[PDB]
Amino acid sequence: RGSHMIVKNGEKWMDRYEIDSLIGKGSFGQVVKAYDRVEQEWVAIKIIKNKKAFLNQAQIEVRLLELMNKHDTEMKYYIVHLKRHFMFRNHLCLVFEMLSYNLYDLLRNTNFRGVSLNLTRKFAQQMCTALLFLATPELSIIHCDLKPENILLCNPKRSAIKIVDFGSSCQLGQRIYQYIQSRFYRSPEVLLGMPYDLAIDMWSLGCILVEMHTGEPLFSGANEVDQMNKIVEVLGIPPAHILDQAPKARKFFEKLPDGTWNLKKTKEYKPPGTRKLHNILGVETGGPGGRRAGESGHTVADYLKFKDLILRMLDYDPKTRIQPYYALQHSFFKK
Numbered sequence: 001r002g003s004h005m006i007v008k009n010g011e012k013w014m015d016r017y018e019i020d021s022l023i024g025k026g027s028f029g030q031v032v033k034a035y036d037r038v039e040q041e042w043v044a045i046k047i048i049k050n051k052k053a054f055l056n057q058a059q060i061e062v063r064l065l066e067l068m069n070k071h072d073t074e075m076k077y078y079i080v081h082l083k084r085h086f087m088f089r090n091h092l093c094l095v096f097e098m099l100s101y102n103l104y105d106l107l108r109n110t111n112f113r114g115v116s117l118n119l120t121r122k123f124a125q126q127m128c129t130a131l132l133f134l135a136t137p138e139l140s141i142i143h144c145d146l147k148p149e150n151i152l153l154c155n156p157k158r159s160a161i162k163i164v165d166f167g168s169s170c171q172l173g174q175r176i177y178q179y180i181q182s183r184f185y186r187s188p189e190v191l192l193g194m195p196y197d198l199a200i201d202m203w204s205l206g207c208i209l210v211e212m213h214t215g216e217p218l219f220s221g222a223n224e225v226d227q228m229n230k231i232v233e234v235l236g237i238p239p240a241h242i243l244d245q246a247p248k249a250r251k252f253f254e255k256l257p258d259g260t261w262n263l264k265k266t267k268e269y270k271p272p273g274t275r276k277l278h279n280i281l282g283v284e285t286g287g288p289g290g291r292r293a294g295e296s297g298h299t300v301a302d303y304l305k306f307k308d309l310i311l312r313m314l315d316y317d318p319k320t321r322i323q324p325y326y327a328l329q330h331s332f333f334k335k
């Protein structure tokens with residue numbers, strides 16, 4: 001009865017899958033850990049709700065994951081592997097490889113003090129390769145929901161990660177969903193109602209990486225106006241050439257007589273561009289909250305490269321925003 005399937009720990013499906021537990025949920029449905037008695041391995045089964053909206057999203061998810069599996073390249077291994085799909089008890093079921101917990105849960109283990117710059121660089125290098133892969137012309141996939149919860153550790157002690165959840169993804173040129181991106185990771189072009197391309201995922205990556213190192217969201221907007229005000233505190237008023245073409249410019253900004261833009265009044269924020277990323281990362285002051293002072297792997301030089309790469313990912317202009325190939329060449333990654 002209704003959308004959400006009946007899940008009893010210890011039960012068995014198709015004399016194959018042995019349901020140990022429920023390992024997650026979201027608007028799409030639920031994920032169960034089950035033992036596949038046939039080829040003797042644990043799997044994560046994403047159970048889709050029996051509503052058209054979610055069936056339709058999952059069907060796109062299946063097409064895009066099946067498209068990625070056609071390519072011979074080591075880079076595709078930064079995306080969760082879809083083993084097979086089938087219908088069961090009137091529900092689409094997507095069988096995935098079993099991974100470990102997400103990057104939010106990793107931050108929770110550190111009590112939101114953040115992981116080391118050295119771990120941040122390993123995640124960044126994997127996320128940038130994953131994005132390079134999604135930008136292969138034949139794929140041109142925009143994930144449109146990058147956040148710490150959709151990045152999973154393969155293994156609880158190792159650094160290897162994968163991206164999951166292509167339910168709200170599309171290909172370059174498509175406009176399907178009214179609202180896209182999780183609010184904290186939502187690019188300015190999407191807030192402004194402007195056309196979006198693969199650059200929106202790079203914006204999200206920049207936000208994710210700062211949060212992974214400091215332990216808190218860079219831009220924790222409670223609504224769209226608060227999101228845009230929080231981005232403006234750090235990066236200043238967006239360029240006139242963007243605001244002149246943006247359908248939703250007047251939701252956040254006013255054009256003055258002289259033709260310069262500034263913020264609408266609210267009905268309290270630090271002045272535009274004064275909440276410097278240099279101070280949020282603590283480049284010269286021992287890292288976030290001073291907690292990495294002395295500690296190896298946390299030099300002013302290491303922090304300067306990190307800061308510089310992040311600001312290239314958080315460029316307001318999606319045409320000049322850094323692209324995955326060029327991000328992988330950044331001195332931040334130099335071996």
Ligand SMILES: Cc1nc2ccc(-c3cc(N)nc(N)c3)nc2n1C[C@@H](C)Oc1ccccc1
Pocket residue numbers: 023024025026031044046080096097098099100101102149150152164165166
């Ligand atoms: C432990 C584990 N292995 C997994 C392997 C794959 C997936 C998964 C794959 C796809 N395409 N979409 C989703 N929403 C999950 N989820 C796994 N999970 C559960 C949790 C940790 O991830 C979650 C991530 C997001 C939501 C809920 C759980």
Ligand SMILES: [Cl-]
Pocket residue numbers: 223224225226
């Ligand atoms: Cl709003």
